[PDB]
Design a protein around this ligand. Sequence first.
Ligand SMILES: Nc1ncnc2c1ncn2[C@@H]1O[C@@H](COP(=O)(O)OP(=O)(O)O)[C@@H](O)[C@H]1OP(=O)(O)O
Ligand SMILES: Nc1ncnc2c1ncn2[C@@H]1O[C@@H](COP(=O)(O)OP(=O)(O)O)[C@@H](O)[C@H]1OP(=O)(O)O
Ligand SMILES: O=C(NO)[C@H](O)[C@H](O)COP(=O)(O)O
Ligand SMILES: [Cl-]
Ligand SMILES: [Cl-]
Lengths: 471, 469
Amino acid sequence: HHMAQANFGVVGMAVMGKNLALNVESRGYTVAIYNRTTSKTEEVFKEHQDKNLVFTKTLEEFVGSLEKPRRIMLMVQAGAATDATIKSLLPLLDIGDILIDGGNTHFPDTMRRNAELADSGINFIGTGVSGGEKGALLGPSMMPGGQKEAYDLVAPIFEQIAAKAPQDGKPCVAYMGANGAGHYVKMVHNGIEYGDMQLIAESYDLLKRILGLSNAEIQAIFEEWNEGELDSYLIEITKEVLKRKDDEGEGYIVDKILDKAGNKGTGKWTSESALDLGVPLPLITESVFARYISTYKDERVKASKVLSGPALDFSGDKKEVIEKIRKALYFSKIMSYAQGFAQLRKASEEFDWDLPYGTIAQIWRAGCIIRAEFLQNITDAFDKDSELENLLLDDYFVDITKRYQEAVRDVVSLAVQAGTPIPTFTSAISYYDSYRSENLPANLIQAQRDYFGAHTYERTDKAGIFHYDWY
Amino acid sequence: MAQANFGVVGMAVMGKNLALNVESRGYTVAIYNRTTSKTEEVFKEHQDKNLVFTKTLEEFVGSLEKPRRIMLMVQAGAATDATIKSLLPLLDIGDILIDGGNTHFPDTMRRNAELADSGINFIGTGVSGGEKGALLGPSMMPGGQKEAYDLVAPIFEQIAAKAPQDGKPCVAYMGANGAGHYVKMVHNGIEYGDMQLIAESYDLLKRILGLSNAEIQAIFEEWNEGELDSYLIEITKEVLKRKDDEGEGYIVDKILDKAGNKGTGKWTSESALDLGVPLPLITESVFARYISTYKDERVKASKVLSGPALDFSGDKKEVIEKIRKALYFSKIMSYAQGFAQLRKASEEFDWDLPYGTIAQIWRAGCIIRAEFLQNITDAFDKDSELENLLLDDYFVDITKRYQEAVRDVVSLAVQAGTPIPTFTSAISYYDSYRSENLPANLIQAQRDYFGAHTYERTDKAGIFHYDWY
Ligand SMILES: Nc1ncnc2c1ncn2[C@@H]1O[C@@H](COP(=O)(O)OP(=O)(O)O)[C@@H](O)[C@H]1OP(=O)(O)O
Ligand SMILES: Nc1ncnc2c1ncn2[C@@H]1O[C@@H](COP(=O)(O)OP(=O)(O)O)[C@@H](O)[C@H]1OP(=O)(O)O
Ligand SMILES: O=C(NO)[C@H](O)[C@H](O)COP(=O)(O)O
Ligand SMILES: [Cl-]
Ligand SMILES: [Cl-]
């Protein structure tokens, strides 16, 4: 009927896949659409009659409608549903065809699928897609990994549909590396997001609890902060939510939202990889635990009634302290990214990916929630030295930490004395102080392990493995 | 050769000592190790003991009286898997196989399911107390079929540490399948946490107060006489006495600050992430080990990154006491988190874990033996459904009285530039746990704004989405 007339195909007609299909079509392509439940495909086709969408009813029809080598983007429920969909497509495909997974997929699944399909001559591109539903329609940030030669055939469409960085128009997409490299980078993006949200939450909490600032006052502070080096979309969202009235009562909606952070699911993934890899990732991990502890609302309400803490009234200079919190925020953000890019470095070694670090920062500049102006300084760092082990060692970040650390320390002293919980700010300064310590007290830990366990140790003065007679 | 009442596989530090423990209780004990020369050493070094030297697995199995009791003390993972695989076909119905290693609990759960109808009794057990614990009396944490447990309970009780308080064996039934190995993992998590807190205390005493090893040795010694009375504090004051065996000065000073790990602390944090359990202190202590392995980077970074170069000008005695208070307070935070994890794991895997009993069997033969373990048991006696140790009267009191000193230690350390990831994590956890309201409301607003994720409200039931545009 429409045999081999479609340039590209999308499976999954929920909002994400639907929007991606419309995005690709709008760039001047005929797009085959498919969904397990046909009514949803029918609904998309009917409402977008003037677009070059090919309505297909079966997988056989879907596959038949596509030019070879076929380019097929899966936008289906992660896990079992993606494997079931892959399994359904496989008999119908030809050698050289290209499957693309745009779901929020756990990278080992992508690595497994990629290896299995390669045995059948089928290319597999696991792609991180950021920006949510609006990003899918208008321009996502994208992180593809898979066979390079297959990806080069997909790249022009991705570069067309991708978000364009507002500073230079560069598309927010690039090849990440083989197999699961793309979904790995997307995972780290999502960990980083968790960290950035907790850091802002701590800033808001300090302003509210210690300085006694109103929602309107706090809105104005974030606005002003966003005009400087902190310039980021999450801070923009923050000052936007602080404006809003409760839709079901007096005051502000933000004050009526129950303090139980959402979901579980996929947010732990970055932390779990860091643990597997021997990578220090304390900031993002504190952010995950901060969400978990918020879900323990009932216990916290009970605990608030029995446990004691300070009842301090702040008497210092508000303006001075606001600026100090601004410094602590940016410093702590720098700690989290340094840790996150160090994790990417280790993962790259472990999986042999040659991850393009500076480019990663470039493609995060638009079409994702963590977009922020300082991503440029991360790119400059890796432009200067692509083998940079850690961002903290780059001149630009060295200067910031030198000048900003004093403020962080003060902020930590103030918040801790006042009793306001700051797990990520405290973790930030602890990482800074650990990373720059030539000697850490892990010599004592090693002595203890050798004492009870005979685990042996290394010495400071000569090569070799040693065991002490403690008895 | 069916002379032997009990068999041990794995003749390294733990298995050798366990074998000798069992033999001392008036048994003849079969010994096996994959490298035969190791078995030969302990056989030769202990000819007065009733040990049976065996060189092959068929001989090992043959030397045991039926129903056979075989305990494995082998390297976790593939080593243990291959040993059990080689061993199973040699075994008879009614035989008992015990995995005493630090096996990742899911492996044990799988093993238990696979062996459920083989006629071979399987027990996965945690063993604590280190090399001397294995010899003189370990804490044991067995899981599996209750019927299987009952078969080994008598001999487990004989070899187990006995609590000094009441003489009770430091072994009890943990629960089905992998429960015992799960409890041991959490035990090690807590252990990592306390070891990092101790290292931070030592770092503060040495770097801020400028104290010598003898001075710090004496401090920990005095601390161990009070409520800080524990195995880890005891062995710290022992370690700090020792002189270098290959040169001048203290051995502790000649040990490279690169902490090793064999997976259990990592596995604890992984499980906490999986279960939705906030476990910041133990997890921070794992990352603290990780960052110590980045020695070359830290050496480079120390020459480039700047920080405070301040000189403590205050009263040393007062600050030492504040560190003591803070160390005890933070030790409590570590256990409270470990037990919160155990509660969530018990519910997830339907283990009905005996929290109070767990604290009891940790009273001896145990790396994490602490003075407040009885108060942990008292807390669970009072409320079997106790959600968190911090809600118990005994712990309410300590935190009330000690929280001020913690804030002072954190502030002093942070201004000085001395890294305290677990001390800061401890006060953060305390301040978060007691906050009726956290700033997660702002996070929920951001998520609804960007991704329509929805929220709950403070003032009414149901789920809501705001029209942000
Ligand atoms: N088991 C399965 N096999 C094949 N496709 C499946 C599937 N489970 C879910 N999907 C597809 O994947 C879904 C989208 O993934 P999702 O679960 O992330 O969506 P949403 O975010 O809207 O809940 C739907 O497109 C679904 O097809 P239907 O519209 O027919 O439900
Ligand atoms: N890959 C493997 N397969 C079978 N057994 C193994 C093994 N790796 C280790 N083991 C056994 O399990 C080990 C348990 O000790 P260990 O490895 O934790 O400490 P140590 O380094 O002191 O031997 C040893 O008993 C070992 O037997 P060998 O003496 O022959 O090494
Ligand atoms: O379980 C033990 N002792 O309690 C073992 O010594 C274990 O190896 C200690 O943990 P680690 O080696 O990961 O530090
Ligand atoms: Cl590939
Ligand atoms: Cl995003």
